[PDB]
C-alpha cells in the first residue's frame, strides 16, 4: 500500500533525526528488543543495590504477544546508573518467567503484596499468579464475564479488591482473598453494568476504598461507590469526550484530580469536586490515546501515549502562560516533552517510582525503551 510505504518512509527518516538528537534531549536511553512484543509494562516497587557497583537494579512486569507460540508473564531486571561466558551481563535480562495462556493484555502487581500479579487474558478469565509459587496453571481464575479486556486495577486500601474492565460492557470486582475457591476459581463479588458500550478502563480512587472510575467507548466517565446498592447507578456520569475514552488515572498527590485519555486525541483534566466543569484539555496527539500516567514524583506533570507512536509529557503548571507564535507551534505550553523513539504504536508505559523521570515504554515492534529526558528540559 502506497499510504503504508509513505508512512514507513516518514517513520524511518524521523527516527534518524531522533537518534542524532538523542544526546541533547535525554540523560538516559536504552533500547532493548524483546523476543516477543509486550502489551503491558509496570515497574515493581523494589530496587536492588550492591556496594561498589555503579548501578542499581530495578525490575519490570512484561508480557509476550503471540497468537502463535507460547506466551509468558515476564519479570525483567534493569540496570540503572547511580550517582555517577562469565562476562558481565547485559543491562537488561529476564529473571522470572511464567507460561501464560494467551497474550498478556495487562499485568499489574498487587500494592499490598508485590508477589501477587493480576493478569488480563484474551479470554474472559482474569488470572492471578504469585511469582514464588512458580520458582503453568494460574493460582486463581476469576469468572465474572464473557468478553476479553484490558482494564485492570488493584485497590490500595483494600488488600485483594481488584477491578476489571471488559468488552462485555461490564466491570467485575472480586476479593482475591476470596473465601474458598471452588477449583482455583473466584466468581465475582459484584458486576457493574451501567455502561452503554465496551469498558476501556477501570481505576480505584487512591484514598477512598469504596470509590472508582470507569471509562468506555460510550464516551463517558463514571464514578462509582461500591457502598451503593444498585450495580447500575454510577455515583456520577460525565460526558468526558467526543470519541471513546480509553483510560483514566488518579493524581497521586490529589484526592480530587483525575485525567482521562480518549480516541478524540485528547486528555481531559477532571476534578471530582465538580465533574460538571472540565478543568482543561491537553492537545497535540495525532491519534488515539490509550495511556495516561501521572509522574509518581511531581504532582504537576503527567504523560500520555497512543497510536501516534508518541509519548507526551505535560506539565500542568505551564497551563496558561502566554507563548510566542513562532514558539506556540510544536504544541501548547502544557507540552513539556515529546518522546519519539518508538517506531510503532506504544502498547503501554510506566514511570519508574524510584528514579524521577525514568520511564519505560513498550511498542508493538517488540522494542522496549527505558529513557529519561535531559535534566535541562525540566530543570532551571
Amino acid at each position: 500500500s502506497f499510504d503504508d510505504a509513505v508512512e514507513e518512509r516518514v517513520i524511518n527518516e524521523e527516527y534518524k533525526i531522533w537518534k542524532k538528537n538523542t544526546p541533547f534531549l535525554y540523560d538516559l536511553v536504552m533500547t532493548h528488543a524483546l523476543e516477543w512484543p509486550s502489551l503491558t509494562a509496570q515497574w515493581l516497587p523494589d530496587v536492588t543495590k550492591q556496594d561498589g557497583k555503579d548501578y542499581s537494579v530495578h525490575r519490570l512486569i512484561l508480557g509476550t504477544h503471540t497468537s502463535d507460540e507460547q506466551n509468558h508473564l515476564l519479570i525483567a531486571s534493569v540496570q540503572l546508573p547511580s550517582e555517577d561466558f562469565g562476562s558481565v551481563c547485559g543491562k537488561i535480562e529476564i529473571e522470572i518467567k511464567i507460561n501464560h495462556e494467551g497474550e498478556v493484555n495487562r499485568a499489574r502487581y498487587m500494592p499490598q503484596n508485590a508477589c501477587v500479579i493480576a493478569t488480563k487474558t484474551p479470554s474472559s478469565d482474569v488470572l492471578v499468579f504469585d511469582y514464588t509459587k512458580h520458582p503453568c496453571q494460574p493460582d486463581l481464575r476469576l469468572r465474572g464475564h464473557q468478553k476479553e479486556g484490558y482494564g485492570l486495577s488493584w485497590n490500595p486500601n483494600l488488600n485483594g479488591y481488584l477491578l476489571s474492565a471488559s468488552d462485555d460492557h461490564t466491570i467485575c470486582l472480586w476479593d482475591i482473598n476470596a473465601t474458598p475457591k471452588e477449583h482455583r476459581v473466584i466468581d465475582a463479588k459484584n458486576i457493574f453494568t451501567g455502561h452503554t458500550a465496551v469498558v476501556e478502563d477501570v481505576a480505584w480512587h487512591l484514598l477512598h476504598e469504596s470509590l472508582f472510575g470507569s471509562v468506555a467507548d460510550d464516551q463517558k466517565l463514571m464514578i462509582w461507590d461500591t457502598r451503593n446498592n444498585n450495580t447500575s447507578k454510577p455515583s456520577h456520569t460525565v460526558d468526558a469526550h467526543t470519541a471513546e475514552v480509553n483510560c483514566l488515572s488518579f493524581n497521586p498527590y490529589s484526592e480530587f484530580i483525575l485525567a482521562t485519555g480518549s480516541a478524540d486525541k485528547t486528555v481531559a483534566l477532571w476534578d471530582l469536586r465538580n465533574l460538571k466543569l472540565k478543568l482543561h484539555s491537553f492537545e497535540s496527539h495525532k491519534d488515539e490515546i490509550f495511556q495516561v500516567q501521572w509522574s509518581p514524583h511531581n504532582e504537576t506533570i503527567l504523560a500520555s501515549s497512543g497510536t501516534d507512536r508518541r509519548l507526551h509529557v505535560w506539565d500542568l503548571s505551564k497551563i496558561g502562560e502566554e507563548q510566542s507564535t513562532e514558539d506556540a507551534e510544536d504544541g501548547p505550553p502544557e507540552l513539556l516533552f515529546i518522546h519519539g523513539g518508538h517506531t510503532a504504536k506504544i502498547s503501554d508505559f510506566s514511570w519508574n517510582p524510584n528514579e524521577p523521570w525514568i520511564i519505560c515504554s513498550v511498542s508493538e515492534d517488540n522494542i522496549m525503551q527505558v529513557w529519561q529526558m535531559a535534566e535541562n528540559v525540566y530543570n532551571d
Binding site: D330, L336, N376
Partner: peptide
C-alpha cells in the same frame, strides 16, 4: 540553549 526545551517540543 533553552532551545533544548524547544527541541524537546518538536516531534
Amino acid at each position: 540553549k533553552p532551545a533544548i526545551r524547544r527541541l524537546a517540543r518538536r516531534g
